[PDB]
PDB file of C-alpha atoms and ligand atoms in Angstrom:
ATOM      1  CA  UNK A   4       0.000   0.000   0.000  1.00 38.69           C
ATOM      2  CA  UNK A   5       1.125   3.385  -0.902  1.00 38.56           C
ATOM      3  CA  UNK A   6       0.426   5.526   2.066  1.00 35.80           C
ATOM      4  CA  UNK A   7       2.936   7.540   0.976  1.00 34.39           C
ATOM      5  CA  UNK A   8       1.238  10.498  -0.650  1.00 33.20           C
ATOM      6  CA  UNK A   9      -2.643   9.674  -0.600  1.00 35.06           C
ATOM      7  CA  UNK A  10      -4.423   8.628   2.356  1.00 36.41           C
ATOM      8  CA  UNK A  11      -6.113   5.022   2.904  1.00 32.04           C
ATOM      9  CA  UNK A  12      -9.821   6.560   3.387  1.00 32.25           C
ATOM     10  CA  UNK A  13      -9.566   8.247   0.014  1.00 31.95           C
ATOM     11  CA  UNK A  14      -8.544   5.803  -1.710  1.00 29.25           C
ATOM     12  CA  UNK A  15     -10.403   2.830  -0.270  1.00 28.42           C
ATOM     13  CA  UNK A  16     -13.493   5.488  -1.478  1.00 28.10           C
ATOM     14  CA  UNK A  17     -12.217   5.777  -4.951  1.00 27.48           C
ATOM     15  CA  UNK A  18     -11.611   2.237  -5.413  1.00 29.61           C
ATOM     16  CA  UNK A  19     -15.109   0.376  -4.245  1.00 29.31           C
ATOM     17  CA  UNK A  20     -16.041   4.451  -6.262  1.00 28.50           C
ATOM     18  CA  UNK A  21     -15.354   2.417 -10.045  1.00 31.39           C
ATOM     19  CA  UNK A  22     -13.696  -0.575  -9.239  1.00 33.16           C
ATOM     20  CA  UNK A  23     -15.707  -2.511 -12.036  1.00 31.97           C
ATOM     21  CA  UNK A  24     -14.190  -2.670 -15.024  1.00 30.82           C
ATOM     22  CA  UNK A  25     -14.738  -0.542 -18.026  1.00 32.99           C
ATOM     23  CA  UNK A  26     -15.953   1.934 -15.070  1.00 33.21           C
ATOM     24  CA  UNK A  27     -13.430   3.962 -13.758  1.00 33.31           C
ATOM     25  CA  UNK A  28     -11.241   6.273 -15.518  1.00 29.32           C
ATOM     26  CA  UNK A  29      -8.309   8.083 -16.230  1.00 29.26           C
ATOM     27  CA  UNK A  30      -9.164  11.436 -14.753  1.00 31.27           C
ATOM     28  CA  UNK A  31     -12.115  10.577 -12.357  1.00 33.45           C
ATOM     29  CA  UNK A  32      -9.919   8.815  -9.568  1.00 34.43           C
ATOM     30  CA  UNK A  33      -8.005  12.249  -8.470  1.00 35.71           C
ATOM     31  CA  UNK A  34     -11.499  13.572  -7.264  1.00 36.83           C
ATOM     32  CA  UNK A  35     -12.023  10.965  -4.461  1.00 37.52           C
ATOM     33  CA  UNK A  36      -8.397  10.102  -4.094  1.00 39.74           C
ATOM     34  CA  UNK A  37      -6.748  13.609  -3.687  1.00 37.14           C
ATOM     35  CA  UNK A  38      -3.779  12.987  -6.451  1.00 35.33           C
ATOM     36  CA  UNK A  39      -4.183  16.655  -8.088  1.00 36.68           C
ATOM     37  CA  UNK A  40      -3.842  17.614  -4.556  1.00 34.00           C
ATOM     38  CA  UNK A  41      -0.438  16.363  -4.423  1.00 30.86           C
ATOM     39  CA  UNK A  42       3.031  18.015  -6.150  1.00 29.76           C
ATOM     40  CA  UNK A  43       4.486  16.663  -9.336  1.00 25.77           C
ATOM     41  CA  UNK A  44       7.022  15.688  -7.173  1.00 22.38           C
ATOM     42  CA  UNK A  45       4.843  13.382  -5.024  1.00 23.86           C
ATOM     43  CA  UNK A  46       2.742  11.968  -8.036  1.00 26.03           C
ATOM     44  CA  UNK A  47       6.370  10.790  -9.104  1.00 24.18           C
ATOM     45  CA  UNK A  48       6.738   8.167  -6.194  1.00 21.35           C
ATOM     46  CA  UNK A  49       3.762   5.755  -6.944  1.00 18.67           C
ATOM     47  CA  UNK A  50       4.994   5.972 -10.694  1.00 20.44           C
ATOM     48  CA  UNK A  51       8.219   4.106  -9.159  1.00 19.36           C
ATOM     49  CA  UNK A  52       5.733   1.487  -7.747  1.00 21.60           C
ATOM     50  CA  UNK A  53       3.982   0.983 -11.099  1.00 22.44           C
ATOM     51  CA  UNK A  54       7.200   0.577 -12.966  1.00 23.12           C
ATOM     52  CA  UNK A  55       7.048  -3.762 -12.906  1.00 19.73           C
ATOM     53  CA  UNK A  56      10.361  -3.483 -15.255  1.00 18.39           C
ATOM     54  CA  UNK A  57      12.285  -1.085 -13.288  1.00 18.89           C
ATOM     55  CA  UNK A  58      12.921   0.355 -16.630  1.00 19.43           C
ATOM     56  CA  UNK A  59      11.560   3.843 -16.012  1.00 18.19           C
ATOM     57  CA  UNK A  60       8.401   3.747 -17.352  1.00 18.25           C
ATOM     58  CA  UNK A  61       5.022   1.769 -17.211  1.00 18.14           C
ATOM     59  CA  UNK A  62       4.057  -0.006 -20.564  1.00 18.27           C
ATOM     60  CA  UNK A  63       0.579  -1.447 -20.984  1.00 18.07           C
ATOM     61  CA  UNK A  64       1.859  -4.786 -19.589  1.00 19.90           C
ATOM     62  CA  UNK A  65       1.666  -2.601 -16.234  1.00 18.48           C
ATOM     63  CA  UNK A  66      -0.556  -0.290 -16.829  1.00 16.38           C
ATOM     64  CA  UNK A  67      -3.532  -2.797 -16.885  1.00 16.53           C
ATOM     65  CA  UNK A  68      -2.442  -3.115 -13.256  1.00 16.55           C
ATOM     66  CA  UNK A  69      -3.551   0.352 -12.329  1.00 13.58           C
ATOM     67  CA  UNK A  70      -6.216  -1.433 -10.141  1.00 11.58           C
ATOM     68  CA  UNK A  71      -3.367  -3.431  -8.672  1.00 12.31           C
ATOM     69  CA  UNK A  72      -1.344  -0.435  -6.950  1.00 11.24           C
ATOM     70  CA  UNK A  73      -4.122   1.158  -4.860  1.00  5.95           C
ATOM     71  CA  UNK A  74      -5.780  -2.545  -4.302  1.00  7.42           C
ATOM     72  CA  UNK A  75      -3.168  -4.904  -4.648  1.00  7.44           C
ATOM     73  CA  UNK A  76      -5.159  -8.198  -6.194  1.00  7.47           C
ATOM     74  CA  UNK A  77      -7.770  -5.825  -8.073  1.00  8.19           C
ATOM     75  CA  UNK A  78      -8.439  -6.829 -11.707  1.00  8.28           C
ATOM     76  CA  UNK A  79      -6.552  -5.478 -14.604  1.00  8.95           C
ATOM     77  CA  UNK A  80      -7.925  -2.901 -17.281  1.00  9.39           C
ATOM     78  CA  UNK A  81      -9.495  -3.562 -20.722  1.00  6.47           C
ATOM     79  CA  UNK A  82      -8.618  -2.164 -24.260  1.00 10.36           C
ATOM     80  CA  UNK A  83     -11.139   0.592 -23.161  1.00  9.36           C
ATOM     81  CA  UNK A  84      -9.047   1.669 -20.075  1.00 10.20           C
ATOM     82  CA  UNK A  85      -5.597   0.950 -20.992  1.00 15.66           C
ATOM     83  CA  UNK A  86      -5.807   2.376 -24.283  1.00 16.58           C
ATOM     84  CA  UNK A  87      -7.572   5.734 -22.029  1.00 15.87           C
ATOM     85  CA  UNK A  88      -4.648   6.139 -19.433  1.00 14.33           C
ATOM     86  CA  UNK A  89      -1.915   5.693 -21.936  1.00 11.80           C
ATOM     87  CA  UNK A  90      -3.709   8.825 -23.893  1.00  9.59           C
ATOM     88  CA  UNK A  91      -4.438  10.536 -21.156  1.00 13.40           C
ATOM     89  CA  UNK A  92      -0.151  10.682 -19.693  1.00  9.88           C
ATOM     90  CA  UNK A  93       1.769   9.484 -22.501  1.00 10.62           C
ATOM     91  CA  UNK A  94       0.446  11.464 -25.457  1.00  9.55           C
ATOM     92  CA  UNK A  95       4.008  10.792 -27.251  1.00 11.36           C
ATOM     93  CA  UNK A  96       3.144   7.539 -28.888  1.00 11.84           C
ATOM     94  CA  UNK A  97       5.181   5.272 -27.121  1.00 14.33           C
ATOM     95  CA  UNK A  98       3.007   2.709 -24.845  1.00 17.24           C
ATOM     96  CA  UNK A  99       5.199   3.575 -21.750  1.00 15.56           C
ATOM     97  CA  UNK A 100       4.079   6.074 -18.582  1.00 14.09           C
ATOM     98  CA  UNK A 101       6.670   8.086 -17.679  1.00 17.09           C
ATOM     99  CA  UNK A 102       7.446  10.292 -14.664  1.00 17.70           C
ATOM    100  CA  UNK A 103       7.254  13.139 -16.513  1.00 15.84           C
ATOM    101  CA  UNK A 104       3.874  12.857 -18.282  1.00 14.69           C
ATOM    102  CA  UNK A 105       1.981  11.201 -15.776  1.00 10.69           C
ATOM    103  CA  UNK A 106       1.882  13.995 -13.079  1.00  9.79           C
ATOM    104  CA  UNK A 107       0.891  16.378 -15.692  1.00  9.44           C
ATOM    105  CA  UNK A 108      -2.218  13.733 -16.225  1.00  4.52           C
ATOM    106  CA  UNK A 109      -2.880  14.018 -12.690  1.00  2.37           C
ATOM    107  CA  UNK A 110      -2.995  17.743 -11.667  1.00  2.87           C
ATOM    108  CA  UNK A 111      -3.579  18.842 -16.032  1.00  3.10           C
TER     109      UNK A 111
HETATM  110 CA1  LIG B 228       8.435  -0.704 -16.932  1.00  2.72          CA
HETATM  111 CA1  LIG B 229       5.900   8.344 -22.838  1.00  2.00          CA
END
């Protein structure tokens, strides 16, 4: 569990909130979790716990996780929430997350 930048109650909230699949999205877990709330800086250190590759950034093959780093056993995501994310923080064309388009998701 992160409990590192976010607190539990907001994000226990925002995960029963749309934690069906094809439910949830992109930019509608920052309202009951508090993420915008946070710094760049601070949005940066759950990107580290996304990264399953330690490469630095946080493909698809960990992105469908997303449910998986504020649940830990959650389900994964579909081609219809993926696909969402990835255009809603990468917006270079690459497939990867990185930890300098994802805060700018979060607070933008
Ligand atoms: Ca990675
Ligand atoms: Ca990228």
């Amino acid at each position: 569990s992160l409990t590192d930048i976010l607190s539990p109650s907001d994000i226990a909230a925002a995960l029963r909130d749309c934690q069906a699949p094809d439910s949830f999205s992109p930019k509608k877990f920052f309202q009951i979790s508090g993420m915008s709330k946070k710094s760049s800086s601070q949005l940066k250190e759950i990107f580290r716990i996304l990264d399953n590759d330690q490469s630095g950034f946080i493909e698809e093959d960990e992105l469908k996780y997303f449910l998986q780093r504020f649940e830990s056993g959650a389900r994964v995501l579909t081609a219809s929430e993926t696909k969402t994310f990835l255009a809603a923080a990468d917006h270079d064309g690459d497939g990867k997350i990185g930890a300098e388009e994802f805060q700018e998701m979060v607070q933008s």
